[PDB]
Enzyme design. Structure first.
Site, PDB file in Angstrom:
ATOM      1  N   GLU A  35       0.798  -1.255   0.000  1.00 29.89           N
ATOM      2  CA  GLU A  35       0.000   0.000   0.000  1.00 29.89           C
ATOM      3  C   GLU A  35       0.830   1.306   0.000  1.00 29.89           C
ATOM      4  O   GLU A  35       0.569   2.232  -0.755  1.00 29.89           O
ATOM      5  CB  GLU A  35      -0.998   0.016   1.194  1.00 29.89           C
ATOM      6  CG  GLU A  35      -2.115  -1.099   1.120  1.00 29.89           C
ATOM      7  CD  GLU A  35      -3.143  -0.952  -0.018  1.00 29.89           C
ATOM      8  OE1 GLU A  35      -3.091   0.028  -0.767  1.00 29.89           O
ATOM      9  OE2 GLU A  35      -4.029  -1.843  -0.164  1.00 29.89           O
ATOM     10  N   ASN A  46      -8.035   8.466  -6.535  1.00 31.18           N
ATOM     11  CA  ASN A  46      -8.774   7.412  -7.228  1.00 31.18           C
ATOM     12  C   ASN A  46      -9.574   7.997  -8.370  1.00 31.18           C
ATOM     13  O   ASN A  46      -9.838   9.204  -8.382  1.00 31.18           O
ATOM     14  CB  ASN A  46      -9.672   6.642  -6.268  1.00 31.18           C
ATOM     15  CG  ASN A  46      -8.901   6.033  -5.141  1.00 31.18           C
ATOM     16  OD1 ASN A  46      -8.049   5.187  -5.369  1.00 31.18           O
ATOM     17  ND2 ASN A  46      -9.194   6.446  -3.911  1.00 31.18           N
ATOM     18  N   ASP A  48     -12.666   7.776  -9.104  1.00 31.34           N
ATOM     19  CA  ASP A  48     -13.917   8.326  -8.607  1.00 31.34           C
ATOM     20  C   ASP A  48     -13.752   9.660  -7.880  1.00 31.34           C
ATOM     21  O   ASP A  48     -14.749  10.187  -7.421  1.00 31.34           O
ATOM     22  CB  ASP A  48     -14.655   7.310  -7.707  1.00 31.34           C
ATOM     23  CG  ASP A  48     -13.895   6.991  -6.434  1.00 31.34           C
ATOM     24  OD1 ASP A  48     -13.084   7.813  -6.005  1.00 31.34           O
ATOM     25  OD2 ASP A  48     -14.089   5.916  -5.851  1.00 31.34           O
ATOM     26  N   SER A  50     -12.132  10.266  -4.960  1.00 27.58           N
ATOM     27  CA  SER A  50     -11.734  10.072  -3.565  1.00 27.58           C
ATOM     28  C   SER A  50     -10.198   9.904  -3.478  1.00 27.58           C
ATOM     29  O   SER A  50      -9.542   9.696  -4.495  1.00 27.58           O
ATOM     30  CB  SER A  50     -12.434   8.846  -2.918  1.00 27.58           C
ATOM     31  OG  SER A  50     -12.213   7.672  -3.686  1.00 27.58           O
ATOM     32  N   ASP A  52      -6.766   8.034  -1.157  1.00 29.79           N
ATOM     33  CA  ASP A  52      -6.247   7.058  -0.147  1.00 29.79           C
ATOM     34  C   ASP A  52      -5.122   7.696   0.679  1.00 29.79           C
ATOM     35  O   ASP A  52      -4.237   8.333   0.094  1.00 29.79           O
ATOM     36  CB  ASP A  52      -5.668   5.827  -0.827  1.00 29.79           C
ATOM     37  CG  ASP A  52      -6.702   5.063  -1.672  1.00 29.79           C
ATOM     38  OD1 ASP A  52      -7.927   5.158  -1.449  1.00 29.79           O
ATOM     39  OD2 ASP A  52      -6.275   4.334  -2.566  1.00 29.79           O
ATOM     40  N   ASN A  59      -9.426   5.068   2.462  1.00 27.39           N
ATOM     41  CA  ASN A  59     -10.102   5.808   1.394  1.00 27.39           C
ATOM     42  C   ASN A  59     -11.094   6.848   1.971  1.00 27.39           C
ATOM     43  O   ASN A  59     -11.815   6.546   2.902  1.00 27.39           O
ATOM     44  CB  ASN A  59     -10.855   4.776   0.546  1.00 27.39           C
ATOM     45  CG  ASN A  59     -11.392   5.340  -0.748  1.00 27.39           C
ATOM     46  OD1 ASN A  59     -11.887   6.451  -0.794  1.00 27.39           O
ATOM     47  ND2 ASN A  59     -11.341   4.542  -1.800  1.00 27.39           N
ATOM     48  N   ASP A 101     -15.562  -4.998   8.883  1.00 29.86           N
ATOM     49  CA  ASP A 101     -16.715  -4.600   8.003  1.00 29.86           C
ATOM     50  C   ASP A 101     -17.462  -5.738   7.315  1.00 29.86           C
ATOM     51  O   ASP A 101     -18.455  -5.481   6.610  1.00 29.86           O
ATOM     52  CB  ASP A 101     -16.269  -3.629   6.879  1.00 29.86           C
ATOM     53  CG  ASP A 101     -17.425  -2.780   6.320  1.00 29.86           C
ATOM     54  OD1 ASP A 101     -18.126  -2.118   7.118  1.00 29.86           O
ATOM     55  OD2 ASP A 101     -17.614  -2.745   5.077  1.00 29.86           O
TER      56      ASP A 101
END
EC number: 3.2.1.17
Length: 129
Positions: A35, A46, A48, A50, A52, A59, A101
């Site tokens: 990462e 990203n 979209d 957003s 990280d 995110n 999650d």
């Protein structure tokens, strides 16, 4: 701050990650390696819109607030900024929520593609823990 490998494994173990939800410490160090290359100041944009943040590339779409991800949530209740600091507490506390999650560590695409099913104990080989 760019951590050393055994230096991150120790900090992670001190913050309660070793076997958190059944994932041994090597899993968490492997995921941070791919990462961020162990750099708390890592960021990435990203498609979209957003972003990280930090050591485990959390995110802004679901987990933290950066004031620029339209339609996003802040489930860890923190500014994305907090995720970049030398002190990893905020990244570790937020990782705990993510891994809880339902999908486990599959939430990190790089863990599934690069760590899962591999000899992850290797990443903690030789460390005083």
């Amino acid at each position: 701050k760019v951590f050393g490998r055994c230096e991150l494994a120790a900090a992670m173990k001190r913050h309660g990650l070793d076997n958190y939800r059944g994932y041994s410490l090597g899993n968490w160090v492997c995921a941070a390696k791919f990462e961020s290359n162990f750099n708390t100041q890592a960021t990435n944009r990203n498609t979209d819109g957003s972003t990280d943040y930090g050591i485990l590339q959390i995110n802004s779409r679901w987990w933290c607030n950066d004031g620029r991800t339209p339609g996003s949530r802040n489930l860890c209740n923190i500014p994305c900024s907090a995720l970049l600091s030398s002190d990893i507490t905020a990244s570790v506390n937020c990782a705990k929520k993510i891994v809880s999650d339902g999908n486990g560590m599959n939430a990190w695409v790089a863990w599934r593609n690069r760590c899962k099913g591999t000899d992850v104990q290797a990443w903690i080989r030789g460390c005083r823990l």
